[PDB]
Design a protein around this ligand. Structure first.
Ligand code: SAM
Length: 283
């Protein structure tokens, strides 16, 4: 319900991140639209986006991994950062946007990474991933893909046993509805075990906190285009839902477990879905 409206809206970083506390006067809406007037909020938003990534990758040892798949790679920042900082890695990205693919390819080559990063305009539910991977990334992607069964079969068939899947996505706390049980069915039917999960709902909502959002949004809307108006209304409904606990923004750490009984993956995953760790309790 509320989750589907935010993903219809989306249709350097295309996630927006972890504010440990509300910082008075920061405006996510102003930063995202007029960064030409680069506030501290421009660099403050970048800091919070790196912090989201730090938590997402908390358990991954990149020195041990060889091959990475990003099944919704946006503008390629995650692949490029990984490739720049870990010269041994080989990384592939899929995006369904032709425009995004062109950008990814250009940015990859500008940084001299075209020998280790490949970009494809392909559909992660319809097109097999092009290799066998040790780590799979889906940051705000799986929630956008209707055929989740096909997506998670594709992930399974192209993940080495014991390989890792890290995802940022939404859990609904009350037709795929993003419930715990629905995510669990996807993982357990496809040889995936939830290892742990950090709930950053409070800190993501801190990023979107704007006591003057109404008069701020009108001022920017004056330089407008209408598809972008209901798209940022979908974001304020996510704020309420996050504050209210209706949905959770969750950073999943998942491991492929080919040798375990699927019914036992489900049993174990269900326990882990009830012990999400609040970011405020994370270190
Ligand atoms: C909110 S963006 C996230 C981009 C990137 N992961 C990031 O964090 O900056 C969602 C991305 O998923 C991609 N995407 C949506 N559906 C897809 C699909 N079925 N197959 C492959 N990519 C898809 C979009 O093209 C877009 O790049």
């Amino acid at each position: 319900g509320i989750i589907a409206s935010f993903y219809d809206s989306l249709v350097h970083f295309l996630t927006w991140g972890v504010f440990q506390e509300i910082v008075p006067g920061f405006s996510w809406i102003r930063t995202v639209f007029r960064p030409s007037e680069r506030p501290e909020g421009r660099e403050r938003l970048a800091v919070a986006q790196r912090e989201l990534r730090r938590v997402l990758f908390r358990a991954v040892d990149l020195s041990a991994i060889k091959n990475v798949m990003d099944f919704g790679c946006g503008h390629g920042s995650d692949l490029i950062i990984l490739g720049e900082q870990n010269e041994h890695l080989k990384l592939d990205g899929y995006t369904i946007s032709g425009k995004q693919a062109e950008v990814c390819k250009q940015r990859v080559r500008t940084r001299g990474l075209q020998n280790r990063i490949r970009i494809f305009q392909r559909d992660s539910a319809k097109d097999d991933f092009p290799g066998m991977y040790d780590l799979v990334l889906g940051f705000e992607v799986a929630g956008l893909i209707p055929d989740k069964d096909a997506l998670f079969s594709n992930i399974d068939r192209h993940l080495t046993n014991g390989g890792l899947l890290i995802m940022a996505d939404f859990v609904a706390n009350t037709t795929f509805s993003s419930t715990r049980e629905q995510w669990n069915k996807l993982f357990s039917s496809n040889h995936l075990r939830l290892v742990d999960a950090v709930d950053v709902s409070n800190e993501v909502a801190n990023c979107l906190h704007n006591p003057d959002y109404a008069a701020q949004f009108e001022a920017l809307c004056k330089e407008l285009d209408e598809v972008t108006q209901r798209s940022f209304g979908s974001y304020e409904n996510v704020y309420k839902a996050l504050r209210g606990g209706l949905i959770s923004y969750v950073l999943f750490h998942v491991q492929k477990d080919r040798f375990s009984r699927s019914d036992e993956l489900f049993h174990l995953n269900a326990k882990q879905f009830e012990q999400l760790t609040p970011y405020a309790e994370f270190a």
